[PDB]
């Protein structure tokens, strides 16, 4: 339709970036010995 | 102070610097920062350049409609030829950007620095007690930049005929070159591709032979790389097993067993081949071109019997006849 061109990328990075953040931590936590 | 200058010279020359700023470096570091900084700005924001001196600006920067693949830094004007065009030679920058001033500022500083870069590849080897000659391997790729950025222009009478600084701009340099010199049909270029093809070939040979004949010291589920520690005494691969396999692939005497002779060949081949390729461009810079076998084989009556050499000429004419649309006013292309 007649939507915003950047809407897609704004929504994509809005989800990816912080999700990628959490995930990087959780996995580095999860793999800490003992 | 043991003596400032005495100290300075000890630092410069110090072999304890993360990056060895040498004596050659004192010239390198600045020239290279200028070349790089001017380029990046040019490539991104420079405006159209009247490369062919016919007032027909070719814009080659990102902000003016180009993308990484098409964009480039355009060569100085043909109106300028071989004349020196330093910024202080223009009524204004506007005038300097229009006649392709940035191009010279870049090629000159780069070529200058890239040479010192060679001078440095010697110096450090000296301060470290290692044999020289590495810098001599680097003389080949350098001798090319030189051939493509300076010799060819000197020879042809203008910097506007030097290779542009961009992807597509380079293909242009090539396609046209071929048309005016028929380089593919020149011994030196052929030696060039032998060296490059060969290099990549050998690069793969060595690479595989060695990697394939490594002594096991790693787990089944452990990077085979860990089987090597920086600062080892003995070797990490069975050069005798390597030679054993390779000698059987072809035949024994046609295989290396002397790592030193192997590595000399490994360096000698590409460097020698590229040296010739660089001499090719430096030679065709004075119009001593490739073999011209046009209409050689002719029949019993005199008719011309074409060879692939002729099919090549047609493709060349297409290039000749179409390059620089509006730049020619006369019959023969003597420039």
């Amino acid at each position: 339709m007649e939507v915003n061109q950047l809407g897609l990328i704004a929504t994509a990075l809005f989800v990816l970036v912080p999700s990628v953040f959490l995930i990087i931590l959780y996995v580095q936590t999860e793999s800490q010995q003992k | 102070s043991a003596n400032l200058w005495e100290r300075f010279c000890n630092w410069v020359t110090s072999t304890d610097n993360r990056l060895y700023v040498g004596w050659f470096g004192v010239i390198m570091i600045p020239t290279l920062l200028a070349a790089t900084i001017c380029f990046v700005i040019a490539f991104i924001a420079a405006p159209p350049v009247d490369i062919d001196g016919i007032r027909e600006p070719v814009s080659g920067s990102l902000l003016y409609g180009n993308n990484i693949i098409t964009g480039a830094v355009v060569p100085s004007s043909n109106a300028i030829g071989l004349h020196f065009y330093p910024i202080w030679e223009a009524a204004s920058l506007d005038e300097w950007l229009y006649n392709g001033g940035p191009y010279q500022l870049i090629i000159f500083h780069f070529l200058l620095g890239a040479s010192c870069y060679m001078g440095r590849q010697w110096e450090l080897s000296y301060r470290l007690g290692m044999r020289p000659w590495i810098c001599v391997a680097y003389s080949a790729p350098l001798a090319s930049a030189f051939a493509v950025f300076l010799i060819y222009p000197i020879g042809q009478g203008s910097f506007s005929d030097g290779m542009p600084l961009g992807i597509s701009g380079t293909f242009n340099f090539m396609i046209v070159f071929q048309a005016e010199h028929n380089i593919l049909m020149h011994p030196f270029h052929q030696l060039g591709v032998a060296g490059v093809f060969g290099g990549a070939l050998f690069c793969a040979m060595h690479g595989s032979l060695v990697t394939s004949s490594l002594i096991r010291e790693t787990t089944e589920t452990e990077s085979a790389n860990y089987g090597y520690k920086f600062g080892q005494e003995e070797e990490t691969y069975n050069i005798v097993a390597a030679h054993g396999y390779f000698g059987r692939l072809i035949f024994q005497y046609a295989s290396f067993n002397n790592s030193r002779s192997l590595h000399f060949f490994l360096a000698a081949w590409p460097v020698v081949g590229v040296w010739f390729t660089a001499l090719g461009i430096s030679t065709m810079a004075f119009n001593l071109n490739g073999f011209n076998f046009n209409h050689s084989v002719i029949d019993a009556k005199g008719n011309v019997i074409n060879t692939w050499a002729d099919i090549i000429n047609r493709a060349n004419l297409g290039m000749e006849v179409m390059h620089e649309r509006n730049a020619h006013n006369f019959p023969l292309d003597l420039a």
Binding site: - | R18, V40, I44, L62, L63, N67, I68, K229, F230
Partner: protein
Amino acid sequence: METITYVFIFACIIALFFFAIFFREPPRITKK
């Protein structure tokens, strides 16, 4: 929009360069 994308990646490669040269894993001898 395109210009920005091209320059960004470039700027990212130069950043990489920096970290690679000045923040590599110091290369240790013998012991490993």
